[PDB]
Amino acid sequence: GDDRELAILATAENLLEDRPLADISVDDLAKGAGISRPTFYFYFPSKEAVLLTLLDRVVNQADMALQTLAENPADTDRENMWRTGINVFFETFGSHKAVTRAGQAARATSVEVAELWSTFMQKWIAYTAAVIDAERDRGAAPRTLPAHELATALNLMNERTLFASFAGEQPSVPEARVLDTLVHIWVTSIYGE
Amino acid sequence: GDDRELAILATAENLLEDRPLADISVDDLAKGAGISRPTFYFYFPSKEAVLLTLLDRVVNQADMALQTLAENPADTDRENMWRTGINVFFETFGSHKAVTRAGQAARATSVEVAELWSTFMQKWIAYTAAVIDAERDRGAAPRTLPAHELATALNLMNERTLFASFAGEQPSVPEARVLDTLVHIWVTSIYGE
Ligand SMILES: CC1CCN(C(=O)NCCc2ccccc2F)CC1
Ligand SMILES: CC1CCN(C(=O)NCCc2ccccc2F)CC1
């Protein structure tokens, strides 16, 4: 039950490593999961719905990791605080490159996928702005841009830059340089006069 | 000749303001341009090719504006230098929101559109890095990140952030705040220790 379901999800994530969702069939997913096509339709209405569930898992995994961090302060300078936070997204999405890639592309064709990204990005921006505000209240960060607007641009930078790196797009920051690149821009823009 | 062609381009840009390219027909474009469908096929192979030509015009317009700037230094602080430069992209693409939007979306489905964006973004990143390097050589900017990697992330930030603003995406920086937001992040990340 949960097992045929997990098998479908696992097969899907595996096949997305070798080709886009458009070139993966329900027959492909049913075969890999060791079920029939009708049985597949019991668990999911479409291959699109399978991707939505995989994305939902990855996004929630990042979100839960960030919550864990937010409850367990690492005893560290402000630079490492931001780095450890950005690193949740670098490792979580970077550990699931095929779902990241397919799920980013599905934003264009799926209202549910677009709304999932939007909902979480809104949450992560709100948390970023809350942390900036705390830094300003403690006198460590200067009162420059509206915190929520700065948070929005930094979050959108990370989305575009991380995913371009993972995809090896031209242009992109090399994956082995992208964390240091983003941390630098976050720290200088949050603390800089 | 060039006139039926310009009419097709103008009709296309006008119709893209009210709906996506998928919901615009060649009949729609031929009618608006006051020609027949066969005559249309003389000027362009597809509605896709029409969008590519419109994008090509917008991208080259931004590029030519930047070249103009690069030959005519405004007598100004470093902050206004970067602002005037970012503003080329804000005004050029923001003056052509429907082509920007459709052309951004076509990256997913058109190798020629993806390669056009890539080619120009590579040029703009190279120029950004050249300016940063000049700032470092004159002793105004510190030698922090590799210039080309910093340039890449700042350019990708601007792409994602400007286009989200123009589209009114959730989340996005309000359009009336996006220039100041980007300039702040550019200046603090380029000059900041
Ligand atoms: C899809 C994208 C992926 C990249 N992304 C991202 O790196 N945000 C960083 C969020 C963050 C870092 C440090 C402290 C708090 C905090 F919220 C947003 C979502
Ligand atoms: C599609 C995107 C749109 C946004 N974008 C962009 O703002 N780049 C800024 C480029 C720049 C600014 C100042 C000086 C030199 C310089 F090159 C890149 C391309």
CSV table of N, CA, C and O in Angstrom, one decimal, chain A residues 71-159:
chain,number,residue,atom,x,y,z
A,71,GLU,N,15.9,25.9,15.7
A,71,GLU,CA,15.7,25.5,17.1
A,71,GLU,C,17.1,25.1,17.8
A,71,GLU,O,17.1,25.0,19.0
A,72,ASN,N,18.1,24.8,17.0
A,72,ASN,CA,19.4,24.5,17.4
A,72,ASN,C,20.5,25.4,16.9
A,72,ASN,O,21.3,25.0,16.0
A,73,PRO,N,20.6,26.7,17.5
A,73,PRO,CA,21.6,27.6,17.1
A,73,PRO,C,23.1,27.1,17.2
A,73,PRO,O,23.6,26.7,18.2
A,74,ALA,N,23.8,27.0,16.0
A,74,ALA,CA,25.2,26.7,16.0
A,74,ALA,C,25.9,27.9,16.6
A,74,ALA,O,25.5,29.1,16.4
A,75,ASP,N,26.9,27.7,17.5
A,75,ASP,CA,27.7,28.7,18.3
A,75,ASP,C,28.8,29.2,17.5
A,75,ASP,O,29.9,28.5,17.4
A,76,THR,N,28.6,30.3,16.8
A,76,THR,CA,29.4,30.6,15.6
A,76,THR,C,29.1,32.1,15.2
A,76,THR,O,28.3,32.8,15.8
A,77,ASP,N,30.0,32.6,14.4
A,77,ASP,CA,29.9,34.0,13.9
A,77,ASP,C,28.6,34.0,13.0
A,77,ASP,O,28.1,33.0,12.6
A,78,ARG,N,28.2,35.3,12.7
A,78,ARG,CA,27.1,35.5,11.8
A,78,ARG,C,27.3,35.0,10.4
A,78,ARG,O,26.4,34.5,9.7
A,79,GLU,N,28.6,35.0,9.9
A,79,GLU,CA,28.8,34.5,8.6
A,79,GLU,C,28.4,33.0,8.5
A,79,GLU,O,27.7,32.6,7.6
A,80,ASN,N,29.0,32.2,9.5
A,80,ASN,CA,28.7,30.7,9.5
A,80,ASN,C,27.2,30.5,9.8
A,80,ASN,O,26.7,29.5,9.2
A,81,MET,N,26.5,31.3,10.5
A,81,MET,CA,25.1,31.2,10.7
A,81,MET,C,24.4,31.2,9.4
A,81,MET,O,23.5,30.3,9.1
A,82,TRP,N,24.7,32.1,8.5
A,82,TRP,CA,24.0,32.2,7.2
A,82,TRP,C,24.5,31.1,6.3
A,82,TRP,O,23.6,30.5,5.6
A,83,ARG,N,25.7,30.7,6.4
A,83,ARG,CA,26.2,29.6,5.5
A,83,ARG,C,25.5,28.3,5.9
A,83,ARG,O,25.2,27.5,5.1
A,84,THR,N,25.4,28.0,7.2
A,84,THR,CA,24.8,26.8,7.6
A,84,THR,C,23.3,26.7,7.1
A,84,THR,O,22.8,25.7,6.7
A,85,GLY,N,22.7,27.9,7.1
A,85,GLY,CA,21.3,28.0,6.6
A,85,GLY,C,21.2,27.8,5.1
A,85,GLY,O,20.4,27.0,4.7
A,86,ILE,N,22.0,28.5,4.3
A,86,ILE,CA,22.0,28.3,2.9
A,86,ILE,C,22.3,26.9,2.5
A,86,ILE,O,21.7,26.3,1.6
A,87,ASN,N,23.2,26.3,3.3
A,87,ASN,CA,23.7,24.9,3.1
A,87,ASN,C,22.5,23.9,3.2
A,87,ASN,O,22.5,22.9,2.5
A,88,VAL,N,21.5,24.1,4.1
A,88,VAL,CA,20.3,23.3,4.1
A,88,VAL,C,19.7,23.1,2.6
A,88,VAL,O,19.4,22.0,2.2
A,89,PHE,N,19.7,24.2,1.9
A,89,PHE,CA,19.1,24.2,0.5
A,89,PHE,C,20.0,23.6,-0.5
A,89,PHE,O,19.6,22.9,-1.3
A,90,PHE,N,21.3,24.0,-0.4
A,90,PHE,CA,22.3,23.4,-1.2
A,90,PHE,C,22.3,21.9,-1.1
A,90,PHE,O,22.4,21.2,-2.1
A,91,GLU,N,22.4,21.3,0.1
A,91,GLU,CA,22.4,19.9,0.3
A,91,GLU,C,21.1,19.2,0.0
A,91,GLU,O,21.1,18.1,-0.6
A,92,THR,N,20.0,19.8,0.4
A,92,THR,CA,18.7,19.1,0.2
A,92,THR,C,18.4,19.1,-1.3
A,92,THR,O,18.1,17.9,-1.8
A,93,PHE,N,18.4,20.2,-2.0
A,93,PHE,CA,18.0,20.1,-3.4
A,93,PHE,C,19.1,19.5,-4.2
A,93,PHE,O,18.8,18.7,-5.2
A,94,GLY,N,20.4,19.7,-3.8
A,94,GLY,CA,21.5,19.1,-4.5
A,94,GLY,C,21.6,17.6,-4.4
A,94,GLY,O,22.2,17.0,-5.2
A,95,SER,N,21.0,17.0,-3.4
A,95,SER,CA,20.8,15.6,-3.1
A,95,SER,C,19.7,15.0,-3.9
A,95,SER,O,19.5,13.8,-4.0
A,96,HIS,N,18.8,15.9,-4.5
A,96,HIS,CA,17.7,15.5,-5.3
A,96,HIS,C,17.6,16.3,-6.6
A,96,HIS,O,16.6,17.0,-6.9
A,97,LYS,N,18.7,16.3,-7.4
A,97,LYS,CA,18.8,17.1,-8.6
A,97,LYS,C,17.7,16.8,-9.6
A,97,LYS,O,17.3,17.8,-10.3
A,98,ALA,N,17.4,15.6,-9.8
A,98,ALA,CA,16.4,15.3,-10.9
A,98,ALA,C,15.0,15.8,-10.5
A,98,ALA,O,14.4,16.4,-11.4
A,99,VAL,N,14.6,15.6,-9.3
A,99,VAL,CA,13.3,16.1,-8.8
A,99,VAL,C,13.3,17.7,-8.9
A,99,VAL,O,12.4,18.3,-9.2
A,100,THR,N,14.4,18.3,-8.4
A,100,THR,CA,14.6,19.7,-8.4
A,100,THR,C,14.4,20.3,-9.8
A,100,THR,O,13.6,21.2,-10.1
A,101,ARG,N,15.1,19.7,-10.8
A,101,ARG,CA,15.1,20.0,-12.2
A,101,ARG,C,13.7,19.9,-12.7
A,101,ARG,O,13.1,20.8,-13.2
A,102,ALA,N,13.1,18.7,-12.6
A,102,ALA,CA,11.7,18.4,-13.2
A,102,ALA,C,10.7,19.3,-12.5
A,102,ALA,O,9.8,19.9,-13.1
A,103,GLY,N,10.8,19.5,-11.2
A,103,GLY,CA,9.8,20.3,-10.4
A,103,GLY,C,10.0,21.7,-10.7
A,103,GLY,O,8.9,22.5,-10.7
A,104,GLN,N,11.2,22.2,-11.0
A,104,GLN,CA,11.3,23.6,-11.4
A,104,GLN,C,10.7,23.8,-12.8
A,104,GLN,O,10.0,24.8,-13.0
A,105,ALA,N,10.9,22.9,-13.7
A,105,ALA,CA,10.3,23.0,-15.0
A,105,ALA,C,8.8,22.9,-15.0
A,105,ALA,O,8.1,23.6,-15.8
A,106,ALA,N,8.2,22.1,-14.1
A,106,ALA,CA,6.8,21.9,-14.0
A,106,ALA,C,6.1,23.2,-13.5
A,106,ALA,O,4.9,23.3,-13.7
A,107,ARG,N,6.8,24.1,-12.9
A,107,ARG,CA,6.2,25.4,-12.5
A,107,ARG,C,5.4,26.0,-13.7
A,107,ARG,O,4.3,26.6,-13.5
A,108,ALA,N,5.9,25.9,-14.9
A,108,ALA,CA,5.3,26.5,-16.1
A,108,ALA,C,4.0,25.8,-16.5
A,108,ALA,O,3.1,26.5,-17.0
A,109,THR,N,3.8,24.6,-16.1
A,109,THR,CA,2.6,23.8,-16.7
A,109,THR,C,1.7,23.3,-15.6
A,109,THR,O,0.6,22.8,-15.9
A,110,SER,N,2.0,23.5,-14.3
A,110,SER,CA,1.2,22.9,-13.2
A,110,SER,C,1.0,24.0,-12.1
A,110,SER,O,2.0,24.5,-11.5
A,111,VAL,N,-0.2,24.4,-12.0
A,111,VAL,CA,-0.6,25.4,-11.0
A,111,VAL,C,-0.3,24.8,-9.6
A,111,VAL,O,0.0,25.5,-8.7
A,112,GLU,N,-0.4,23.5,-9.4
A,112,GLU,CA,-0.2,23.0,-8.1
A,112,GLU,C,1.3,23.1,-7.7
A,112,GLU,O,1.7,23.3,-6.6
A,113,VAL,N,2.1,22.7,-8.7
A,113,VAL,CA,3.6,22.8,-8.5
A,113,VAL,C,4.0,24.3,-8.3
A,113,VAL,O,4.7,24.5,-7.4
A,114,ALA,N,3.5,25.2,-9.2
A,114,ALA,CA,3.8,26.7,-9.0
A,114,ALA,C,3.4,27.1,-7.6
A,114,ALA,O,4.1,27.9,-6.9
A,115,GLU,N,2.2,26.7,-7.1
A,115,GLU,CA,1.7,27.1,-5.8
A,115,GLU,C,2.5,26.5,-4.6
A,115,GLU,O,2.7,27.1,-3.6
A,116,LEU,N,3.1,25.3,-4.8
A,116,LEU,CA,3.9,24.7,-3.8
A,116,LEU,C,5.2,25.4,-3.6
A,116,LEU,O,5.6,25.7,-2.6
A,117,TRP,N,5.9,25.7,-4.7
A,117,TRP,CA,7.1,26.5,-4.7
A,117,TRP,C,6.8,27.8,-4.0
A,117,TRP,O,7.5,28.3,-3.1
A,118,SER,N,5.7,28.5,-4.5
A,118,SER,CA,5.3,29.9,-3.9
A,118,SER,C,5.1,29.8,-2.4
A,118,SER,O,5.6,30.7,-1.6
A,119,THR,N,4.4,28.9,-1.9
A,119,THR,CA,4.0,28.8,-0.5
A,119,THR,C,5.3,28.6,0.3
A,119,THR,O,5.5,29.4,1.2
A,120,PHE,N,6.2,27.7,-0.1
A,120,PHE,CA,7.4,27.5,0.7
A,120,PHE,C,8.4,28.7,0.5
A,120,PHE,O,9.0,29.0,1.5
A,121,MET,N,8.5,29.3,-0.6
A,121,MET,CA,9.4,30.4,-0.8
A,121,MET,C,8.9,31.5,0.0
A,121,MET,O,9.8,32.2,0.7
A,122,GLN,N,7.6,31.8,0.1
A,122,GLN,CA,7.1,32.8,1.0
A,122,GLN,C,7.5,32.5,2.4
A,122,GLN,O,7.9,33.4,3.2
A,123,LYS,N,7.4,31.2,2.9
A,123,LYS,CA,7.8,30.9,4.3
A,123,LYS,C,9.3,31.2,4.5
A,123,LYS,O,9.6,31.8,5.6
A,124,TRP,N,10.1,30.9,3.5
A,124,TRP,CA,11.6,31.0,3.7
A,124,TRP,C,12.0,32.4,3.7
A,124,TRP,O,12.9,32.8,4.4
A,125,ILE,N,11.3,33.2,2.8
A,125,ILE,CA,11.5,34.7,2.8
A,125,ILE,C,11.1,35.3,4.2
A,125,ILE,O,11.8,36.2,4.7
A,126,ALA,N,10.0,34.9,4.7
A,126,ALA,CA,9.5,35.4,6.0
A,126,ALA,C,10.5,35.1,7.1
A,126,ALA,O,10.9,36.0,7.9
A,127,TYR,N,11.0,33.9,7.1
A,127,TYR,CA,12.0,33.5,8.1
A,127,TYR,C,13.3,34.3,7.9
A,127,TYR,O,13.9,34.8,8.9
A,128,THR,N,13.8,34.4,6.7
A,128,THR,CA,15.0,35.2,6.4
A,128,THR,C,14.8,36.7,6.9
A,128,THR,O,15.7,37.2,7.5
A,129,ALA,N,13.7,37.3,6.6
A,129,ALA,CA,13.4,38.6,7.0
A,129,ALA,C,13.4,38.7,8.6
A,129,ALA,O,13.9,39.7,9.1
A,130,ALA,N,12.8,37.7,9.2
A,130,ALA,CA,12.8,37.7,10.7
A,130,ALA,C,14.2,37.6,11.2
A,130,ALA,O,14.5,38.2,12.3
A,131,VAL,N,15.1,36.8,10.6
A,131,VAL,CA,16.4,36.7,11.1
A,131,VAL,C,17.1,38.1,10.9
A,131,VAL,O,17.8,38.6,11.8
A,132,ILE,N,17.0,38.7,9.7
A,132,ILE,CA,17.6,40.0,9.5
A,132,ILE,C,17.1,41.0,10.5
A,132,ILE,O,17.9,41.8,11.0
A,133,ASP,N,15.8,41.1,10.8
A,133,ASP,CA,15.2,42.0,11.7
A,133,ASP,C,15.8,41.8,13.1
A,133,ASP,O,16.1,42.8,13.8
A,134,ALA,N,16.0,40.5,13.5
A,134,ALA,CA,16.7,40.2,14.8
A,134,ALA,C,18.1,40.7,14.8
A,134,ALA,O,18.5,41.2,15.8
A,135,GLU,N,18.8,40.6,13.7
A,135,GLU,CA,20.2,41.1,13.6
A,135,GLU,C,20.2,42.6,13.7
A,135,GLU,O,21.2,43.2,14.2
A,136,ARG,N,19.2,43.3,13.2
A,136,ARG,CA,19.1,44.7,13.3
A,136,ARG,C,18.7,45.1,14.7
A,136,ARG,O,19.3,46.1,15.2
A,137,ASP,N,17.8,44.4,15.3
A,137,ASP,CA,17.4,44.7,16.7
A,137,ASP,C,18.5,44.6,17.7
A,137,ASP,O,18.6,45.4,18.6
A,138,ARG,N,19.5,43.6,17.5
A,138,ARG,CA,20.6,43.4,18.4
A,138,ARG,C,21.7,44.4,18.0
A,138,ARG,O,22.7,44.4,18.8
A,139,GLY,N,21.6,45.2,16.9
A,139,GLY,CA,22.6,46.2,16.6
A,139,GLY,C,23.8,45.6,15.7
A,139,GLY,O,24.7,46.3,15.5
A,140,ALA,N,23.7,44.4,15.3
A,140,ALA,CA,24.7,43.7,14.4
A,140,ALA,C,24.5,44.1,12.9
A,140,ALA,O,25.5,44.3,12.3
A,141,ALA,N,23.3,44.3,12.5
A,141,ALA,CA,23.0,44.7,11.0
A,141,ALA,C,22.5,46.1,11.0
A,141,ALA,O,21.6,46.5,11.8
A,142,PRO,N,22.8,46.9,10.0
A,142,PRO,CA,22.3,48.3,9.8
A,142,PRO,C,20.9,48.3,9.2
A,142,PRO,O,20.6,47.3,8.5
A,143,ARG,N,20.2,49.4,9.5
A,143,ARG,CA,18.9,49.5,9.0
A,143,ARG,C,18.9,50.1,7.6
A,143,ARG,O,18.9,51.3,7.4
A,144,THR,N,19.0,49.2,6.6
A,144,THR,CA,19.2,49.7,5.2
A,144,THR,C,17.9,49.4,4.4
A,144,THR,O,16.9,50.1,4.8
A,145,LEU,N,17.9,48.4,3.5
A,145,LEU,CA,16.7,48.2,2.8
A,145,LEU,C,15.6,47.6,3.7
A,145,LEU,O,15.9,47.0,4.7
A,146,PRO,N,14.3,47.8,3.3
A,146,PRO,CA,13.3,47.0,3.9
A,146,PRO,C,13.7,45.5,4.0
A,146,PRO,O,14.1,45.0,2.9
A,147,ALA,N,13.6,44.9,5.2
A,147,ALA,CA,14.2,43.5,5.4
A,147,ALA,C,13.5,42.5,4.5
A,147,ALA,O,14.1,41.6,4.0
A,148,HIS,N,12.1,42.7,4.3
A,148,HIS,CA,11.4,41.7,3.6
A,148,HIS,C,11.7,41.7,2.1
A,148,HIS,O,11.8,40.7,1.4
A,149,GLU,N,12.0,42.9,1.6
A,149,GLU,CA,12.4,43.1,0.2
A,149,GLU,C,13.8,42.6,-0.1
A,149,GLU,O,14.0,41.8,-1.1
A,150,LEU,N,14.7,42.8,0.8
A,150,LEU,CA,16.1,42.3,0.7
A,150,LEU,C,16.0,40.8,0.8
A,150,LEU,O,16.7,40.0,0.0
A,151,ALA,N,15.3,40.2,1.8
A,151,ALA,CA,15.1,38.8,1.9
A,151,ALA,C,14.5,38.2,0.6
A,151,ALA,O,15.0,37.1,0.2
A,152,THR,N,13.6,38.8,0.0
A,152,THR,CA,13.0,38.3,-1.3
A,152,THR,C,14.1,38.2,-2.4
A,152,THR,O,14.2,37.1,-3.0
A,153,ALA,N,14.8,39.2,-2.6
A,153,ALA,CA,15.8,39.2,-3.7
A,153,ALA,C,16.9,38.1,-3.4
A,153,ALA,O,17.4,37.5,-4.3
A,154,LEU,N,17.4,38.0,-2.1
A,154,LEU,CA,18.4,37.1,-1.8
A,154,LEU,C,17.9,35.6,-2.0
A,154,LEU,O,18.6,34.8,-2.4
A,155,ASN,N,16.6,35.4,-1.6
A,155,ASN,CA,16.0,34.1,-1.8
A,155,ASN,C,15.9,33.8,-3.3
A,155,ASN,O,16.2,32.6,-3.7
A,156,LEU,N,15.4,34.7,-4.1
A,156,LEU,CA,15.3,34.5,-5.5
A,156,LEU,C,16.7,34.3,-6.2
A,156,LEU,O,16.8,33.4,-7.1
A,157,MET,N,17.7,35.1,-5.7
A,157,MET,CA,19.1,34.8,-6.2
A,157,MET,C,19.4,33.3,-5.9
A,157,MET,O,20.0,32.7,-6.8
A,158,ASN,N,19.1,32.9,-4.7
A,158,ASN,CA,19.6,31.5,-4.3
A,158,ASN,C,18.9,30.5,-5.2
A,158,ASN,O,19.5,29.5,-5.6
A,159,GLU,N,17.6,30.7,-5.4
A,159,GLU,CA,16.8,29.7,-6.3
A,159,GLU,C,17.5,29.6,-7.6
A,159,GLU,O,17.8,28.5,-8.1
